[PDB]
């Protein structure tokens, strides 16, 4: 009558599981795939035990360290952007700057963004979009490509919280009718990076107050 009593899974989906210790002809009879009489045959021995020879872990020297101050950026290639543009899934007349937030909205950069996005030149030879771009940084080649295109890149700084705010300030608004303002850089290295002209940083391209303040301090 009903289809309910005649449903099968797709061919290749399911196998029979191997039934041990259930008679000899089955194939996994008495010893049930264990062989004879070892430690293995009954007790548990850690799979990676080495017999007592110094193990692969214990032999070699331990190396390096994890930089906890490190912030790995999501990479995003010019090529991808170009592809998106070609498709027509890239709407930028409303918002003239393609910021990280904008990218994420588009799909452009997918998954979660923790620290920020680095732009990279994969399809620089075929890139030609006169666009304002913003990200956490970009490779020199990428920058060059952008400039050739008649585009405009600047590299901004975002702390985690700041970045989060940028990505979706709507949430923030919903929460406490406000968006948290952008933190200044404080780590010296970060400051240096944003000062650098070649990196195309937002401290010198916007002529920020912070730099000026620093200069003043130095003077006095």
């Amino acid at each position: 009558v009903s289809i309910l009593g005649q449903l099968k899974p797709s061919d290749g989906s399911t196998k029979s599981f191997k039934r041990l210790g259930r008679g000899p002809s089955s194939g996994l009879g008495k010893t049930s795939g264990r062989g004879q009489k070892g430690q293995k045959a009954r007790g548990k021995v850690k799979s990676w035990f080495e017999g007592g020879q110094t193990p692969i872990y214990k032999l070699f020297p331990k190396i390096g360290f994890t930089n906890v101050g490190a912030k790995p950026l999501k990479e995003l290639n010019l090529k991808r952007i170009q592809w998106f543009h070609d498709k027509n899934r890239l709407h930028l007349q409303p918002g003239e700057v393609l910021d990280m937030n904008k990218m994420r909205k588009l799909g452009l950069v997918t998954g979660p963004i923790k620290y920020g996005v680095k732009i990279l030149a994969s399809g620089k030879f075929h890139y030609n979009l006169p666009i304002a771009l913003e990200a956490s940084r970009a490779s020199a080649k990428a920058i060059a490509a952008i400039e050739k295109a008649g585009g405009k890149f600047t590299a901004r700084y975002y702390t985690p919280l700041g970045l989060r705010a940028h990505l979706n300030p709507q949430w923030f608004l919903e929460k406490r009718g406000r968006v948290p303002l952008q933190a200044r850089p404080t780590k010296r290295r970060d400051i240096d990076f944003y000062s650098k002209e070649e990196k195309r940083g937002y401290l010198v391209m916007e002529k920020d107050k912070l730099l000026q303040d620093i200069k003043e301090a130095q003077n006095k």
Partner: protein, 239 residues
Amino acid sequence: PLPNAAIPPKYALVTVRSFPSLEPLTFVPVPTSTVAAPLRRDILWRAVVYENDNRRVGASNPPGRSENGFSRRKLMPQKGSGRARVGDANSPTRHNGGRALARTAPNDYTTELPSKVYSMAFNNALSHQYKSGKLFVIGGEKVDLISPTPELDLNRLDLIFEGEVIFRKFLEEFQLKGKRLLFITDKTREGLIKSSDPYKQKVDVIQKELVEVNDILRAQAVFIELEALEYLAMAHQKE
């Protein structure tokens, strides 16, 4: 080029009716994806099985040698007895003892399924039902009716108490006495449920949001509100 590259038919007509009898009022065009999907029984199987798994109670709780009542005393000394060696009286080897590899308290049989797949399965079920001709849609207020809704009968999917009698009459008319039926309703039509409860064994009455693939598949004839149907379609859309 590629010859034979046609464009597919995107709609399908489902005749809206009036639930005490079933007099056709209008045709409504519903999309092909929710009512004329090709029958992919494997997808259906994935859904149904999943549903069953989630429905399990899982109360198999035999006593293991830990939970079994006996003491930990070694019943007989290791040697000197001339008998086989014995431990505590909880070993599964002995008749009174625990069970080996016991299953314990609430057994969890729940499984996952991608939402999209589930939606597809639902759609497929509906399509199957429609193909069978055992899908019947009931409605009125929302769409323009070609033929005017008759008097003494409404489009709400609702009704000694008289209602029960009416229901019985309907059943008699439609040759579906013994067979199981499924009423998919937009809201709690209490009256309808009351009417049906004499025939509870063969009648499912389900709120929109809680309808299951199994329930549709099980049912020999389904009666659904137009609004409810629309909602379902929206839920299991595609995008």
